[PDB]
């Protein structure tokens, strides 16, 4: 799906100019679980900006299903990201006044579509994620893990193709993070969807299948996993990150 080539992010505020991204060629195909990882001060937020189109792009040649974002306008970009892209944020954002069910059904309640299909979709998502029993509760009377799972499931109801994700462990302990990561990995297999994260937690990066390392841009030395035991891979990731 995604072939990110020549990652260029321009700068030059006042007089100082920085090449935080110095041109990177990136290859993913259908159904991967790639996550790029660096260190502090490597511009992970700028990685979101260049990748997730949160802000206006500067340069580069990157296409989504062959659709380049650099030959296409701002409002068209908003429509493209709203009808073709999804996001998951570091801190969950759920309206307190609404209910758990209403929060997930909100994105589909703006296109004037039939009610029965929406009910069936919510049924399927809730059953497959495990929050079905909480159909009439409020976000003020449930724990953090359930809230984060609901936030993650909110982005899996508008018929998505690619769902971005910043670090989904900032406001979670180990148990909730492990449950969420296992559920997301299972969702990757049941319905085919590519998930890209950039996190600072090696534990959260051990779940992946292709990890990319950066220091200032083009540096690679990526790993492959393939048939690892899921723990030696974690040790190797930690050792490589410490050395580099």
């Amino acid at each position: 799906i995604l072939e990110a080539n020549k990652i260029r992010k321009s700068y030059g505020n006042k007089l100082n100019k920085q090449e935080v991204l110095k041109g990177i060629d990136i290859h993913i195909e259908k159904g991967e679980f790639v996550s790029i990882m660096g260190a502090s001060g490597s511009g992970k937020t700028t990685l979101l900006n260049v990748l997730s189109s949160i802000d206006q792009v500067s340069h580069g040649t990157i296409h989504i299903n062959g659709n380049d974002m650099t030959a296409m306008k701002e409002k068209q970009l908003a429509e493209f990201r709203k009808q073709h892209l999804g996001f998951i944020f570091q801190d969950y954002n759920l309206l307190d006044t609404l209910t758990v069910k209403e929060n997930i059904l909100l994105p589909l309640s703006i296109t004037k579509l039939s009610k029965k299909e929406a009910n069936r979709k919510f049924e399927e998502v809730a059953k497959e994620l495990g929050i079905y029993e909480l159909r009439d509760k409020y976000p003020n009377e449930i724990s953090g893990g359930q809230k984060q799972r609901t936030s993650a499931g909110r982005a899996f109801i508008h018929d998505p193709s690619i769902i971005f994700a910043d670090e989904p462990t900032g406001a979670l302990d180990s148990k909730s993070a492990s449950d969420l990561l296992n559920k997301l990995s299972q969702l990757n297999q049941k319905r085919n969807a590519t998930i890209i994260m950039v996190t600072h937690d090696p534990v959260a990066a051990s779940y992946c299948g292709r990890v990319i390392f950066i220091k200032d841009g083009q540096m690679y030395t990526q790993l492959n996993k393939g048939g690892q035991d899921r723990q030696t891979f974690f040790q190797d990731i930690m050792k490589t990150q410490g050395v580099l």
């Binding site: 949160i54 206006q56 996001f87 006044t97 309640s109 003020n140």
Partner: protein
């Protein structure tokens, strides 16, 4: 989905959280309606005073609307900032910027206009109460009746509609501006700014100590000193919060060792970092509170003088200038069945030198020390003292003088006559006045000389500074009895208001300072409510940023009954510092000029500070009720 029902839920949720805002809105509308109704009441003209009358409420309203508008604008620019996590979400779902504005301008207009409608309804039943309160401080009788005064509704509606228009303009200016889907150790300067601020405040207070002392005495040298004092005080107050709190907190922290309990760790965590950000608001709060308290205290101190100075300015109950008018008024009193103990005394004006009796500095000149014009009286007329030749006794206290004209003990007192000068010594100082202030210039005392020396002084009769009338024509009164009829007889005798009466100078000053205190008190109450609400509206954010901390501590065995105990001290430390600084400011500002109004302090200041402290600590008590709610839902 269900836009209207979502808006209704949001409106109810907003109404549940922000109720002090509604209370403040209704209270402000009530006071504005009350003052505007009071201004146009035809009975307001019964307030006889040196001031215009109903032209002061026109100042009270215009100075109140500014505070109300400032409070409302700041509250509405605080409210919208806490709703970005929803604006971003609505922007990413697909709703444009022309629908979010209608979403968030329908959960506010109903609340605002409902509060406005309630305020007008409840301002009708307090106008009579306000009028009755006013016609008890000025001591006048009236027939205050209830009426609607349709003129006030237009003013209130126009003013608040304009304020709401400004609010909407400001809100629209923010939504489509900050968007684009965007969801420690001390330093050397920080170790000097606190000391600089503390020393600036201390030296400002020290300079404020002297003022009208023995130094700086010039008609123009006081203004520069006062401006310097105000500037230094304001700058020191600003620098206090931005650097000095950090220094003291750092010392207290690195003085306990490492054994910090729950209360200290909950207290020091907030006010070492959060107080630094808010350094432009606490200064305003402290200065305005100090100003209000000081002005109120003086306005109550001058009420005690409104009685003593009226008793003392005229020695008797009446004073008379013209012999014919006095004799005809006595003729009228003759059939009035009034037994008047009349006493009269010729008055002479002579100049003397008292430069050798002042223990201060020649800067305390107040005229030529060798040519002070004083009032000299005979010894036979005075029925209390029998002085001899070569001895003079001063009369009167005049609290101003003891702090201004310092007088030595018996030295040498020279009399500046035409061709002679006798040495005299200071025996003592009297307290009562035997001469009205008209004959003795501004506040100069009167001297007593021997009758024998009087027979030469009156024979000499230096014709240079003598007054037009050399007499103290004044009618006294019998034992305490009815006096009002004699009062209107006195007014109908004198249509040229050139005689002075004891019971008439006691009314204009009382009315003037009563109006001053009325205005100042109501304005101070309004500012108290405003500051309380504003300071309460930041603890919500400060507590919802400390919610994770509670959750972590709760996994280590701590119970809610201890977290609440720690919060009960954190809130006290948050709400105490501005009040204490304001109290110190007020006490160090009042004491500089307490001896310019009345002769009694420590009476009003204690009452004012106690009332302010209670009405300000109500809001401090009204915050643990939200902290407990935050703690309970942090499992």
């Amino acid at each position: 989905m269900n836009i209207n029902q979502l808006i209704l839920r949001n409106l109810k949720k907003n109404l549940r959280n922000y109720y002090l805002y509604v209370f403040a809105l209704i209270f402000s509308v009530a006071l504005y309606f009350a003052f505007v109704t009071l201004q146009y009441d035809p009975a307001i003209n019964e307030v006889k005073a040196s001031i215009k009358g109903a032209a002061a409420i026109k100042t009270a309203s215009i100075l109140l609307v500014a505070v109300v508008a400032i409070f409302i604008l700041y509250a509405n620019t605080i409210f919208i900032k806490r709703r970005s996590k929803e604006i971003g979400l609505f922007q990413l779902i697909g709703m444009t910027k022309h629908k979010i504005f209608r979403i968030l301008s329908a959960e506010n207009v109903m609340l605002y206009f409902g509060s406005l409608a309630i305020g007008v309804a409840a301002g009708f039943s307090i106008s009579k109460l306000v009028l009755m309160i006013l016609f008890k401080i000025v001591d006048v009788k009236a027939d205050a009746k209830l009426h609607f005064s349709e003129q006030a509704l237009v003013q209130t509606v126009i003013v608040f509609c304009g304020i709401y228009l400004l609010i909407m303009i400001m809100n629209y200016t923010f939504i489509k501006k900050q968007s684009i889907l965007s969801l420690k150790k001390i330093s050397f300067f920080q170790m000097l700014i606190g000391a600089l601020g503390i020393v600036l405040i201390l030296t400002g207070y020290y300079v404020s100590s002297e003022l009208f002392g023995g130094k700086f005495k010039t008609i123009n040298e006081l203004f520069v000193a006062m401006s310097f004092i105000l500037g230094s005080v304001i700058i020191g107050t600003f620098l206090f919060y931005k650097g000095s709190v950090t220094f003291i907190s750092n010392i207290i922290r690195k003085s306990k060792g490492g054994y910090l309990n729950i209360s200290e760790v909950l207290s020091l965590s907030s006010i070492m970092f959060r107080m630094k950000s808010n350094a432009l608001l606490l200064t305003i709060i402290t200065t305005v509170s100090a100003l209000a308290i000081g002005l109120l205290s003086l306005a109550y101190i001058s009420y005690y003088s409104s009685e003593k100075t009226a008793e003392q300015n005229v020695a008797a109950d009446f004073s008379f200038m013209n012999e014919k008018d006095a004799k005809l008024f006595e003729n009228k009193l003759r059939e009035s069945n009034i037994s008047f103990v009349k006493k009269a005394t010729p008055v002479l004006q002579a100049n003397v030198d008292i430069a050798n009796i002042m223990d201060g500095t020649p800067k305390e000149m107040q005229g030529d020390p060798g040519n002070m014009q004083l009032a000299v009286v005979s010894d036979k007329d005075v029925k209390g003292v029998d002085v001899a030749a070569g001895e003079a006794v001063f009369s009167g206290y005049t609290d101003l003088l003891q702090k201004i004209m310092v007088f030595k003990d018996s030295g040498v007192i020279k009399v500046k006559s035409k061709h002679e000068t006798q040495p005299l010594k200071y025996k003592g100082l009297r307290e009562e006045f035997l001469v009205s202030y008209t004959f003795t210039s501004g506040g100069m005392p009167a001297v007593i000389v021997d009758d024998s020396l009087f027979k030469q002084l009156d024979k000499d009769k230096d014709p240079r500074i003598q007054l037009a009338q050399s007499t103290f024509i004044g009618v006294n009164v019998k034992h305490d009895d009815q006096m009002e009829k004699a009062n209107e007889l006195f007014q109908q005798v004198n249509k040229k208001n050139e005689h002075l009466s004891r019971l008439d100078t006691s009314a204009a000053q009382k009315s003037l300072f009563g109006m001053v205190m009325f205005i100042v008190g109501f304005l101070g109450l309004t500012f108290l409510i405003t500051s309380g609400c504003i300071l309460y509206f930041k603890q919500m954010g400060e507590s919802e940023d400390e919610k994770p901390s509670y959750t972590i501590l709760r996994k280590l065995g701590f119970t809610q009954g201890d977290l609440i105990k720690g919060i009960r001290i954190k809130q006290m430390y948050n709400f105490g510092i501005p009040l204490v600084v304001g109290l110190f400011h007020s006490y160090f500002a009042v004491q500089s000029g307490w001896f310019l109004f009345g002769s009694e302090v420590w009476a009003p200041m204690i009452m004012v500070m106690v009332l302010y402290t209670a009405l300000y600590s109500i809001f401090g008590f009204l915050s643990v009720l939200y902290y407990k709610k935050v703690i309970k839902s942090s499992l």
